[PDB]
Amino acid sequence: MIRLTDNRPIGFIDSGVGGLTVVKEALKQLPNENILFVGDTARCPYGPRPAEQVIQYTWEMTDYLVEQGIKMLVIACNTATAVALEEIKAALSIPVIGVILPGTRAAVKKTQNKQVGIIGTIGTVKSQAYEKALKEKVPELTVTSLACPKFVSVVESNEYHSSVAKKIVAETLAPLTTKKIDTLILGCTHYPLLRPIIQNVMGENVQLIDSGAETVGEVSMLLDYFNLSNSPQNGRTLCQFYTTGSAKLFEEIAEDWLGIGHLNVEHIELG
Amino acid sequence: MIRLTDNRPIGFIDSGVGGLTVVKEALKQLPNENILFVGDTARCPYGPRPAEQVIQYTWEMTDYLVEQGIKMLVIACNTATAVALEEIKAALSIPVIGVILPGTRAAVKKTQNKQVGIIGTIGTVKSQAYEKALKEKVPELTVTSLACPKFVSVVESNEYHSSVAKKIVAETLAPLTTKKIDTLILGCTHYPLLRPIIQNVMGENVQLIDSGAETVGEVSMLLDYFNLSNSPQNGRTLCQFYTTGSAKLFEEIAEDWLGIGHLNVEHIELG
Known part of the structure; x- marks a missing residue:
């Protein structure tokens, strides 16, 4: 004791x-x-x-x-x-x-309609690390993985609050807004800096998971x-x-x- | 991997x-x-x-x-x-x-006004296990510990939904309602069965922690x-x-x- x-x-x-x-x-x-x-x-x-x-x-x-x-x-x-x-x-x-399992665990716990999304670098997305971790826990999940190529440069250039950032995030995440996703994993450590913009684009009904x-x-x-x-x-x-x-x-x-x-x-x- | x-x-x-x-x-x-x-x-x-x-x-x-x-x-x-x-x-x-630290950790994370309470058997309360664990994490916390002598018998007798239960819980927790406590730890594993009654007595503004x-x-x-x-x-x-x-x-x-x-x-x- x-x-x-x-x-x-x-x-x-x-x-x-x-x-x-x-x-x-x-x-x-x-x-x-x-x-x-x-x-x-x-x-x-x-x-x-x-x-x-x-x-x-x-x-x-x-x-x-x-x-x-x-x-x-x-x-x-x-x-x-x-x-x-x-x-x-x-x-x-x-x-x-x-920094993969903790976020995965949290996403599984927060989703209600089992429609989960994950955004990150093309390397992370193509590796399928998150998709595999998610399905190993709950196979019925419908997972949508989307690479966001320019997010990192926007953040590293300290321009994550600019109009350039708002346009890049809006255009990149567009196709992700029509999947009924209720939980989105920020699968790149650079992304928390863009959280407000990402939240606005996805909508108040989408719970973001900061891995x-x-x-x-x-x-x-x-x-x-x-x-x-x-x-x-x-x-x-x-x-x-x-x-x-x-x-x-x-x-x-x-x-x-x-x-x-x-x-x-x-x-x-x-x- | x-x-x-x-x-x-x-x-x-x-x-x-x-x-x-x-x-x-x-x-x-x-x-x-x-x-x-x-x-x-x-x-x-x-x-x-x-x-x-x-x-x-x-x-x-x-x-x-x-x-x-x-x-x-x-x-x-x-x-x-x-x-x-x-x-x-x-x-x-x-x-x-x-079953002590996990609940303690959660209580520390949920309290906002630092007024934390813990209820349990007289043995648990007198041991100061929770009070000590809580203060070792956040010394500024004002902790109120209250023994609830008859809760266990009420639950083990499967009478946790009866009028006898409502009276025993109401009378026992009375003095705990005037401490501005915003977080209450259920420090006895028998207590979750009385949660609804405990919640009603403490009020909607009190977050209960199930250890x-x-x-x-x-x-x-x-x-x-x-x-x-x-x-x-x-x-x-x-x-x-x-x-x-x-x-x-x-x-x-x-x-x-x-x-x-x-x-x-x-x-x-x-x-």
């Missing part, structure tokens, strides 16, 4: 900057937890790379944070989750969670299960970001998306 | 019959999972017993279900959770979850985390109850509370 106070940080790894929305949710849902994040922007994206490379690079980010003292790991990008998560999870002693937000929800439970929670008396005292690419660009994007002022971003080297 | 189909049952253990409400939630939230439940009614209650006995008896129920093939264990009663859970969880290779329901919510996530889910193609094919006391009485109570017709209940012997 011993509750332990563990102030070690929770680690988050990503090939790019999308995972920052998962961190944003962690800051809100887990106010007392310390955070470490690595963005391998020098080698982003991982999608087109052979599994061997993806695994190698994901291991390099993992090893870096483990050495920095993390007590739990969140693999924030889709490719690393689908390709390297199982190997890393099996080798490490710390808990490891990805990253659901992942953080699982982390909250896992902290309790594994007795790894920090104490509120300590609170969050550390939030550090690392990037293999431009620290300047990373900082600009991160500070904009998180909207909480100055953030600590350090350029690092991997492999 | 290998998803395994594991049709082994999830086990639930309890000193008494209260845990049946946790099973009721499992049947609803996890429609494809097989279930095994043991109620040590021949030695209920565990509360007044020395920790040594509680641990011994809980281990006997655990060993029985492990030998019956369970893949995960839910300790459904408060005393076993507070006294024996940590030892059992540390010794077994299968996941083990209790057992939240525990099943965690189980759902743990099945994914540990890759232990059964498949929907198999569905639930097994639901067996075991009791060390009267199988007749247990069956009468279980069939009434679950309201799904005939249930398989077998009298067994432990230690």
Whole structure:
């Protein structure tokens, strides 16, 4: 019946900057937890790379944070989750969670008419990761998967509130509005920045599922299960970001998306 | 990226019959999972017993279900959770979850004015298990704990819809209605049967937290985390109850509370 106070940080790894929305949710849902994040922007994206490379690079980010003292790991990008998560999870002693199943679980729980949609990059959509995960849980589901090619560029360019964004989202999601979908999974970590526009286009009757937000929800439970929670008396005292690419660009994007002022971003080297 | 189909049952253990409400939630939230439940009614209650006995008896129920093939264990009663859970969880290779933290976590997430209440047996209330768990998460919470001495007898006697029930609940919870509480934890597994009455007494502005329901919510996530889910193609094919006391009485109570017709209940012997 011993509750332990563990102030070690929770680690988050990503090939790019999308995972920052998962961190944003962690800051809100887990106010007392310390955070470490690595963005391998020098080698982003991982999608087109052979599994061997993806695994190698994901291991390099993992090893870096483990050495920095993390007590739990969140693999924030889709490719690393689908390709390297199982190997890393099996080798490490710390808990490891990805960003596909949590969102899938939530979608299955929220749908009422079993008409579920998922939007994301063409890589994610073509991999069928979400469709397969959804049907393995509820085979009767009618799943519509739609790639949204330009959403990422709009968000990374910090133009997710512009007229260009409203047009791109409206035109891209058009065919998705006539499927009677009542639950839509935001299958790309960049998409939460476009949520208001996406919600308006889909309509108030469509429940949006933020995969990253659901992942953080699982982390909250896992902290309790594994007795790894920090104490509120300590609170969050550390939030550090690392990037293999431009620290300047990373900082600009991160500070904009998180909207909480100055953030600590350090350029690092991997492999 | 290998998803395994594991049709082994999830086990639930309890000193008494209260845990049946946790099973009721499992049947609803996890429609494809097989279930095994043991109620040590021949030695209920565990509360007044020395920790040594509680641990011994809980281990006997655990060993029985492990030998019956369970893949995960839910300790459904408060005393076993507070006294024996940590030892059992540390010794077994299968996941083990209790019924206090899940409810606590949910209460912390739902409260808005930080005025939280918890009702349960005098044993649970005096142990301060919930108050301590709540404050370890959010120290600013104002927690009101109230013992409800006769609720269990009303429920076990299958009189939870009677006028006697309405009077006992109304009079017992009276002082709890003037604390501006916006979140109330049902800290006894017997209480879900009195939920409608409790809700009416507390008012529509009070969110009730079903600790057992939240525990099943965690189980759902743990099945994914540990890759232990059964498949929907198999569905639930097994639901067996075991009791060390009267199988007749247990069956009468279980069939009434679950309201799904005939249930398989077998009298067994432990230690």
